[PDB]
């Protein structure tokens, strides 16, 4: 035998990063070197799994600030966390009494969201985490349009939510 030497279309995650490097090299030749992207390899799948597991807590690894195509995947699961933190800052305050009861109900929903993470995944794959938090994430972002982050308090709230 001398080994038939297979196609490149049946190969990837090692040929993929190589072929992406070749594509970037052709593009940087055709531009003249005025493009300059960092980290063409990294981040992997499982490290991003642990990172997005940390992102749903409300903390970051300082990747955001207020392969490389996965950022095109990452942003839509990124923009969920950026509104989720923006609700907990809207519950940082201990106001109306009906407004206090309203905000304690919002914190009781945040407790559900904090409980779903670290209890469902025993380190599942990335796209499963994204797909499970697709039908749930837009529902959470809907509540950011519901809440203030003026915003009504008292009767002007009690008829508005009614």
């Amino acid at each position: 035998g001398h080994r038939e030497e297979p196609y490149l279309t049946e190969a990837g995650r090692d040929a993929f990063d190589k072929f992406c490097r070749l594509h970037q090299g052709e593009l940087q030749l055709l531009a003249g070197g005025v493009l300059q992207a960092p980290q063409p390899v990294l981040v992997k799948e499982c490290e991003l799994v642990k990172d997005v597991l940390n992102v749903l807590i409300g903390v970051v690894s300082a990747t955001f600030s207020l392969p490389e195509s996965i950022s095109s995947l990452l942003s839509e699961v990124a923009e969920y966390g950026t509104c989720y933190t923006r609700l907990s800052h809207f519950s940082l305050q201990p106001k109306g009494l009906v407004f206090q009861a309203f905000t304690s109900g919002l914190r009781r929903y945040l407790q559900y969201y904090r409980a779903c993470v670290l209890s469902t995944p025993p380190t599942l794959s990335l796209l499963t985490i994204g797909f499970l938090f697709k039908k749930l994430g837009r529902q959470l972002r809907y509540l950011a349009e519901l809440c203030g982050v003026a915003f009504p308090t008292g009767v002007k709230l009690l008829s508005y939510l009614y």
């Binding site: 196609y7 279309t9 049946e10 190969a11 995947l73 796209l127």
Partner: protein
């Protein structure tokens, strides 16, 4: 090409699949190592991801984005919202099939591309059916209860996946009509 196909079909366009609104997803297909054989199977695979993008964009665009700010029944209203709620749950086996492909790739990455095309070939007839269903409602400004007939006359076809896929969405749009009838009578 292996992980990149999944990245593209998930609804996030890659660095090889140039996103356009007049060609959808399309490969560059000008590499100095291009094979003629890979072209046709890629041209077949791009269409389903292109349709999936518009479906998810439609459902996000018109369900859960207002708090009751005249209104139209083929852009807003409860019957279109019921249509989108049924729509997202009908696309769940597409997602589950995409989850099934990655396990096969992790078992061994040297798998044929025709196998992946063979897997996607059952959604391949259903997706062009539902595109004209959303397009007719959008064009003809179809208001309210007239949505209910529109899918129902299109469920007189003979393809089994089209009938079984449409019936769930029709059940949700029936459920809201039952919900108003429970109060009015």
């Amino acid at each position: 090409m292996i992980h990149e196909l999944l990245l593209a079909l998930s609804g996030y366009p890659g660095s090889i699949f140039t996103w356009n609104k007049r060609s959808g997803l399309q490969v560059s297909q000008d590499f100095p190592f291009l094979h003629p054989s890979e072209t046709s199977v890629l041209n077949r695979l791009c269409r389903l991801g292109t349709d999936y993008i518009r479906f998810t964009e439609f459902i996000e665009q018109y369900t859960g984005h207002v708090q009751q700010q005249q209104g139209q029944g083929g852009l807003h209203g409860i019957y279109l919202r019921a249509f989108c709620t049924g729509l997202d749950s009908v696309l769940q086996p597409y997602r589950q099939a995409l989850l099934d492909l990655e396990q096969e790739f992790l078992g061994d990455p040297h798998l044929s591309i025709s196998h992946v095309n063979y897997f996607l070939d059952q959604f391949q007839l259903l997706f062009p059916s539902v595109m004209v269903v959303v397009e007719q409602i959008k064009s003809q400004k179809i208001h309210g209860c007239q949505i209910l007939e529109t899918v129902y006359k299109h469920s007189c076809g003979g393809l089994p996946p089209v009938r079984s896929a449409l019936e769930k969405i029709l059940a949700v749009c029936h459920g809201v009509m039952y919900k108003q009838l429970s109060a009015w009578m």
